[PDB]
Design an enzyme around this catalytic site. Sequence first.
Site, PDB file in Angstrom:
ATOM      1  N   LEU A  39      56.991  14.338  14.108  1.00 11.48           N
ATOM      2  CA  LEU A  39      56.175  14.242  15.319  1.00 11.48           C
ATOM      3  C   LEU A  39      55.264  12.999  15.247  1.00 11.48           C
ATOM      4  CD1 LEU A  39      54.945  17.955  15.739  1.00 11.48           C
ATOM      5  CD2 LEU A  39      56.717  16.807  17.059  1.00 11.48           C
ATOM      6  N   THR A  45      54.761   5.524  10.285  1.00 11.00           N
ATOM      7  CA  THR A  45      54.530   4.075  10.284  1.00 11.00           C
ATOM      8  C   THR A  45      53.804   3.660   9.007  1.00 11.00           C
ATOM      9  OG1 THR A  45      54.733   3.918  12.680  1.00 11.00           O
ATOM     10  CG2 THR A  45      53.494   2.153  11.601  1.00 11.00           C
ATOM     11  N   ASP A 121      61.996   3.368  11.945  1.00  8.26           N
ATOM     12  CA  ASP A 121      60.727   4.020  12.243  1.00  8.26           C
ATOM     13  C   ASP A 121      60.638   4.532  13.687  1.00  8.26           C
ATOM     14  OD1 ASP A 121      58.041   4.937  12.175  1.00  8.26           O
ATOM     15  OD2 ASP A 121      57.188   2.903  12.130  1.00  8.26           O
ATOM     16  N   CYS A 151      53.255  17.922   8.782  1.00 11.36           N
ATOM     17  CA  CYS A 151      51.838  18.257   8.671  1.00 11.36           C
ATOM     18  C   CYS A 151      51.346  18.931   9.928  1.00 11.36           C
ATOM     19  CB  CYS A 151      50.982  17.044   8.324  1.00 11.36           C
ATOM     20  SG  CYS A 151      49.237  17.442   8.061  1.00 11.36           S
ATOM     21  N   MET A 162      42.347   8.504  15.297  1.00 13.36           N
ATOM     22  CA  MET A 162      41.094   7.750  15.184  1.00 13.36           C
ATOM     23  C   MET A 162      41.230   6.471  14.357  1.00 13.36           C
ATOM     24  SD  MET A 162      39.369   9.226  17.233  1.00 13.36           S
ATOM     25  CE  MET A 162      37.847   8.170  17.270  1.00 13.36           C
ATOM     26  N   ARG A 249      39.655 -12.087 -12.981  1.00 14.71           N
ATOM     27  CA  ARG A 249      40.182 -12.704 -14.179  1.00 14.71           C
ATOM     28  C   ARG A 249      39.132 -12.521 -15.257  1.00 14.71           C
ATOM     29  NH1 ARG A 249      41.504 -18.734 -12.110  1.00 14.71           N
ATOM     30  NH2 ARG A 249      42.036 -18.992 -14.329  1.00 14.71           N
ATOM     31  N   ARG A 344      59.574 -26.735 -12.013  1.00 16.87           N
ATOM     32  CA  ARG A 344      58.557 -25.724 -11.723  1.00 16.87           C
ATOM     33  C   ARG A 344      57.852 -26.006 -10.405  1.00 16.87           C
ATOM     34  NH1 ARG A 344      53.248 -23.275 -13.287  1.00 16.87           N
ATOM     35  NH2 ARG A 344      53.778 -21.085 -13.718  1.00 16.87           N
ATOM     36  N   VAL A 387      49.035 -13.225 -13.174  1.00 23.29           N
ATOM     37  CA  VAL A 387      49.094 -11.759 -13.076  1.00 23.29           C
ATOM     38  C   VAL A 387      48.364 -11.314 -11.789  1.00 23.29           C
ATOM     39  CG1 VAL A 387      48.219  -9.614 -14.152  1.00 23.29           C
ATOM     40  CG2 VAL A 387      49.460 -11.292 -15.541  1.00 23.29           C
ATOM     41  N   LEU A 388      47.157 -11.867 -11.570  1.00 18.70           N
ATOM     42  CA  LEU A 388      46.313 -11.577 -10.421  1.00 18.70           C
ATOM     43  C   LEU A 388      47.018 -11.958  -9.106  1.00 18.70           C
ATOM     44  CD1 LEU A 388      43.814 -10.602  -9.028  1.00 18.70           C
ATOM     45  CD2 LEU A 388      42.452 -12.287 -10.190  1.00 18.70           C
TER      46      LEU A 388
END
EC number: 2.7.1.105
Lengths: 442, 442
Positions: A39, A45, A121, A151, A162, A249, A344, A387-388
Amino acid sequence: PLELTQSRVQKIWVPVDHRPSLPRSCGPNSPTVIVMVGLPARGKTYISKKLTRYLNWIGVPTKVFNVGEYRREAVKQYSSYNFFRPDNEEAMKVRKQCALAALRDVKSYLAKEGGQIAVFDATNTTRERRHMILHFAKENDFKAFFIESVCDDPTVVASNIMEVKISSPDYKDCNSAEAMDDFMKRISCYEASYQPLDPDKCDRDLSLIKVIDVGRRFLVNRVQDHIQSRIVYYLMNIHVQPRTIYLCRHGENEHNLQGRIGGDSGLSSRGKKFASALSKFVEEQNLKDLRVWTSQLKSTIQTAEALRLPYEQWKALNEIDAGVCEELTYEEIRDTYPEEYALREQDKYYYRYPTGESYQDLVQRLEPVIMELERQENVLVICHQAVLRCLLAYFLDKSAEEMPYLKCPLHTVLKLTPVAYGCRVESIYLNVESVCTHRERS
Amino acid sequence: PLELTQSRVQKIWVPVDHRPSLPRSCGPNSPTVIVMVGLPARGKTYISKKLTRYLNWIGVPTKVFNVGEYRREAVKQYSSYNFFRPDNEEAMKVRKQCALAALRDVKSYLAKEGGQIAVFDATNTTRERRHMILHFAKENDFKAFFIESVCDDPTVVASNIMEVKISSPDYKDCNSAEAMDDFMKRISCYEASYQPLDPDKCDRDLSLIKVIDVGRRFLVNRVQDHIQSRIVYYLMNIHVQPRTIYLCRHGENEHNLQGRIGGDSGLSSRGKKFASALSKFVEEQNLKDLRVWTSQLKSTIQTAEALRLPYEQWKALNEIDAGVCEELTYEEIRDTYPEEYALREQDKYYYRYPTGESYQDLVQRLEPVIMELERQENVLVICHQAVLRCLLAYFLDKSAEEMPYLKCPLHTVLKLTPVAYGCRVESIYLNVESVCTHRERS
Ligand SMILES: O=c1[nH]cnc2c1c(-c1ccc(Cl)cc1)cn2-c1ccccc1
Ligand SMILES: O=c1[nH]cnc2c1c(-c1ccc(Cl)cc1)cn2-c1ccccc1
Ligand SMILES: O=P(O)(O)OC[C@H]1O[C@](O)(CO)[C@@H](O)[C@@H]1O
Ligand SMILES: O=P(O)(O)OC[C@H]1O[C@](O)(CO)[C@@H](O)[C@@H]1O
């Protein structure tokens, strides 16, 4: 015999390709149509967008096909719930055409654009609509996997309206009260014809997941493959509970001062000042509970040590491995390895350092970090530049191409607040000087 | 301020411990009692043993407490199903005492032996028994997670009796027909009082997984933490379908001939001969489908190239990283790094090479490999000595201490056939000479 060559960018050993005078291509496993079921205001979504964000980040090309967006495109302006009435013959024809147009784009995405997963969707609340989607999947040799969100809590429904429905382009000219009232009537239009998934009798042979009461309970039926199993695991780890993710970092290190990459150097005097500034910042956030994660490299551990809080070291959070280029400056890399330096610069995401890693390798390493970040609430991750950028690309839905260039300065906290269909990002510079390690594309 | 030291064995940065004149210990998250639920011959012992094998291998101390083994210990010899009769007042008292003695050992394991997970392997078919286990868990501050196996297929029940019940120490003096007949009567003793888990109404607040029809369907309720989520993912990936796992190393390489560790060297002349011998072997196995997995290192790829079969390269299958000791001989390691050499010899599993890995790191890297091996059917893994020892320790339930010393010779296929509660292992030497890379403890 068995002659191989190492590809220059990714460093992959491939058979020496002595293609004959007429080289042949043979370009390019079965794609999947993920069918959302339920529903309106059931978080379909939310599931679609979040799952797509995760699948793309791990390297599975995924796209959402939202039938409502095809409708907003076909029908000029939205008037009311009257458009969704089961007795609205004309709009019912339009809505079917929109679903068929979305499926047409699903076929084009999976069969002609190199897409692996298409997330359909829509409500797909009737057995008739689902039978049609199954027929479409079978005839196109696509797999079908159903994700139903069930649900009946009115608090959860009202919260969804809302949070993300009233702010929809459909309700631009409406105030919060009229939009909420219209949306409740809109939901009622679907309730009579709604046939939930029945894995017990009717839908016994379908591959499905029933997400019950915002992930409190799950019904899993006939998981066919690796990707469906991964989706199920992901859905079981995510939550909608309020929390904050802080990413930063380590404080400036000795290698940062020398312009050297990698290594396991300790905090500089400024880095130690940041670590103290971070403790004050953390204290000022007044968080009931906070999990602190570091890498196994000295500089992140020393930064966490200043907090006087328990922390967990993850080898998966260790900076990108530069292989032979470890502990070298970028100038020394360009002069000793000019071919490697240029390769690179041209392909920063896929480029693998010799005996080292690529940003692509980082993603694979960081998948368990992401899965655990999803499960957790308030978390502070003290890590490294590359990594960040990878973690941030996951939260901010940034592509593989943009990922190696995301700005992640030293002595700056990135405060992530999950809201609506993504993250609100606040940057907090902790007023401690450092060198700049950011390098733009050339 | 923020002074750290690197631990010699594991290479972990820890705060410089300038303990005062009176150093204080503070030794040593909540343990979990996994409660098996279901009628006999439902694969509860199969689940218990396999899950324990996986959890221990990933580093979570786990132990099975099978109530039937406590019964075989308390009661001299097994006579018949009459012992399991609900009207057998005396045996019912004995069986309760055995369950309580197992729980006593559960408390001792989790609270006093550093155990993290206790798998309580019993029928636990009544709400009364389960309420008692919950009370025991709540009073001891242990978490409770229920795993119920539901199957009403008589073919599956008969197969379980034939595969592992008739061969039970209870049926030593019995022939296959009498043991099968007695076991069917034994199952019937439990059917009247059996109350399945009801997550809908009665067991709504319990953390549980219902494995329905040998993993065809799952009911998952209230997964509280990381470990329960991992268990659920594992149970969803494993299967009981017949298949074969072939494990081998790449054919002998140039570094093997020089006695050098790591690197990315190619196959020697003998290594190429093994690769051809492997193709003949694979062909002779006459497998309908076979998945071939390699590392990203040249020697395993060259070996797979000889098979003329499609293969997948996994960076997770790459040999243990020796860090600074890469491409060195063991003699050069002992002479350049004598402290490092001795540290490794003393603690081979936990020892981490400088800027390199430990066998412990390998396990973490190989977890996705294991999860995918579980999902698959016929698989050939062409890898490296340390990687092979880790995978073999998982399949053969070998400890962390034995793992770095498992014999994995070159030019030898390890054929693994899943049977009963583990693996049948067949070794197939492909009659091609090579150097010996095995080094026993000193
Ligand atoms: O089950 C729902 N019902 C109504 N709303 C919902 C959900 C979920 C949700 C569903 C499945 C899972 Cl595994 C996690 C969350 C998210 N949301 C949501 C709430 C507010 C804003 C945007 C989305
Ligand atoms: O559900 C069962 N019912 C009867 N027997 C069973 C099972 C399972 C099983 C259960 C859950 C899962 Cl996720 C996988 C397998 C394994 N076995 C088994 C079969 C033969 C020998 C030893 C064990
Ligand atoms: O991908 P980039 O821009 O080289 O950034 C990653 C590098 O940055 C560093 O963290 C140093 O700033 C190195 O450890 C690492 O090699
Ligand atoms: O743990 P061990 O016994 O040193 O074995 C692993 C070593 O064996 C090798 O595969 C060479 O035989 C090396 O690549 C690796 O360092």
